[PDB]
Symmetry: C3
Subunit: 105 residues, 3 copies
């Protein structure tokens, strides 16, 4: 089943702030990694101080909503880039099926 994989590479200090935006979007979760890096926007600069989020979204609209909120709220003032990859989910939130009367477990 196709899904958008939204990636946000940004400053570590934004971790909780971005996790709240992701949650508010309706996305079921996110994965976050510590990283290093170098950029050319030269907002932060010309240890690892980055974080990388990967968020598998329900729709393209969901991914765009997260992206647009993060970028508008933070990217004039903080380093970061955002991009999307195409993914196909094999086992996701629905691993054990729906809840309620259509449940199979």
């Amino acid at each position: 089943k196709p899904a958008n994989k939204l990636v946000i590479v940004t400053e570590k200090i934004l971790l909780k702030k971005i996790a709240k935006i992701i949650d508010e979007s309706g996305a079921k979760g996110y994965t976050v990694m510590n990283t290093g890096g170098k950029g050319s926007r030269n907002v932060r600069s010309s240890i690892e101080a980055n974080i990388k989020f990967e968020i598998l979204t329900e729709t393209r609209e969901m991914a765009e909503e997260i992206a647009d909120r993060v970028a508008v709220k933070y990217f004039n003032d903080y380093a970061g880039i955002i991009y999307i990859c195409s993914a196909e989910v094999l086992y996701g939130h629905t691993f054990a099926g729906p809840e309620g009367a259509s449940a199979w477990s």
Copy 2:
């Protein structure tokens, strides 16, 4: 050469268990990273990890010989472990330039 990039994000304590499945599948290698995260299945036995905890999880990336190999790995991980452990599995398309 086009390839399937299988991604398994799961509890860090499954590292050796998932490496065993990968090895047994015929896959030629894997890359693994520490991560944090949050999900909605709420099956981690110890609850959601701290937001600061960027080693609750591991992420495997496995460039597989075929699509069927990636699915074999996914299916065995999931049936063996995902009722008792947190985790998700997806695939991305990759073109291998060198290595592999």
Copy 3:
């Protein structure tokens, strides 16, 4: 805008050397992670890493301007280092949204 995401997984000791290759290609930046791993080339001079060692390797992700730039980096790294050093290099398609 429709970009290439070039991925280089290789021995951590090559961090500075590959960063220089990336910078000389004209790439606007890169992201680098520690990783563990296993492969089948069996080139790494110190043998396979411990399953628990999640710092044997580095993984670079480079969003490039063109496919030509991605290829320049890849070819440079492999040709100069892959006889002697472990690693793999691949490309994923990415669409940059905020960039």
